[PDB]
Amino acid sequence: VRLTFADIELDEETHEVWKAGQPVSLSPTEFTLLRYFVINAGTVLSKPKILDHVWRYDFGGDVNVVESYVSYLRRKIDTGEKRLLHTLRGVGYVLREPR
Amino acid sequence: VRLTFADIELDEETHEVWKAGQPVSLSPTEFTLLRYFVINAGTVLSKPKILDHVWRYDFGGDVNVVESYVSYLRRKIDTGEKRLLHTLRGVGYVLREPR
Amino acid sequence: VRLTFADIELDEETHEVWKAGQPVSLSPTEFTLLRYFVINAGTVLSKPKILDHVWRYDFGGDVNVVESYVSYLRRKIDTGEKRLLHTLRGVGYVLREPR
Amino acid sequence: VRLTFADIELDEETHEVWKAGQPVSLSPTEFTLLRYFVINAGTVLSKPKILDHVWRYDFGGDVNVVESYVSYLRRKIDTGEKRLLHTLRGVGYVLREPR
Amino acid sequence: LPIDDLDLTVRSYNCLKREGVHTVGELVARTESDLLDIRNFGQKSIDEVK
């Protein structure tokens, strides 16, 4: 039941994550975000539905929170500038591998 | 749920294409243009209706934007001068199999 | 039947506990909490789920009671600052072997 | 077949109690309580579980009956302030021979 | 009202708890003959109920 993509690995029981088997400590918010994108891998995801589902409906102010999130993941799980979590401007982000 | 037109392959689930064996990138607006063209493949679309379906309803700009977008399509999907995606002067745009 | 993890031992036949080779006294509350921790070895425990399961549902007080209880458990069995019982801010606690 | 523990001795053929074979009797309620105690020697006996098994289930009264009964048992066989059947608050009592 | 709320005693409480007499409504419905039929009934219980 443990969920992975390519080499990044995740457990829904112990909530441990493996960057190709390498240790990493992740804050709970973007932890649930990452768990989301793994559970619906194969689909591009955009900020309206991000802040609708993984954030409370009462949040009616700022929007750049998910951009800051994806920024911390970008700096954390990918050393190369070319990142596996590709970004499509205006339609959000998707989780692929370079072709 | 998939989208096909002869040598044109579109998956909207994770927003990807393949033409003759090579995935390519594209802007969101022109991607939505292509999506509309392939769902309404074999049917002629008028530019009024095209804009009303793909762009903003309150778009007060000119009409050459759709020409620019379709040109950007054409420099990416069909290399030959004879055109899979065809234009009818005064009636709009259409997608066909070359004859 | 008797539960164990690394050094910790626990028997529910007569409700006794063991922290690396000795009998330690514990109140029934923290006994039930550690028991609920050892049933889910490999699983992380969150304050809401524990207050639902081991605590009564109509508990009208503040959650901080379980904070006090887990602090007591830390100073009970995890005498050193390095701990078998690990904290996760905004999430809860788990019981894994310290690394 | 007599149920024994160090000095405590109980028979199910003539229904008599012994503390290392000295003159001692027991009223039927406490006698049945000690029968359950010896049949569960080394196993904890909680107030709910004793009032279920050794006490008839129709009991609409309060728990203090079992406290009075265990006081009778202490003053009868465990006369010394330090006893052989030891009390855990909330969890009842258990056979823990003093070391 | 519950009979126990009348601040009764050991034997009456035990009798109402083991047997299952809960409210004074059933006591005012039941006559003296219908309540004295119970075995091991106390004279103090009879006096206080009267």
Curated annotation (Swiss-Prot), chain E:
This is DNA-directed RNA polymerase subunit alpha. Belongs to the RNA polymerase alpha chain family. Homodimer. The RNAP catalytic core consists of 2 alpha, 1 beta, 1 beta' and 1 omega subunit. When a sigma factor is associated with the core the holoenzyme is formed, which can initiate transcription. The lineage of its organism: Bacteria, Bacillati, Actinomycetota, Actinomycetes, Mycobacteriales. DNA-dependent RNA polymerase catalyzes the transcription of DNA into RNA using the four ribonucleoside triphosphates as substrates. It comes from Mycobacterium tuberculosis (strain ATCC 25618 / H37Rv). The N-terminal domain is essential for RNAP assembly and basal transcription, whereas the C-terminal domain is involved in interaction with transcriptional regulators and with upstream promoter elements. Induction: 3-fold repressed by starvation. The chain holds residues 249 to 298 of 347 of the full protein.
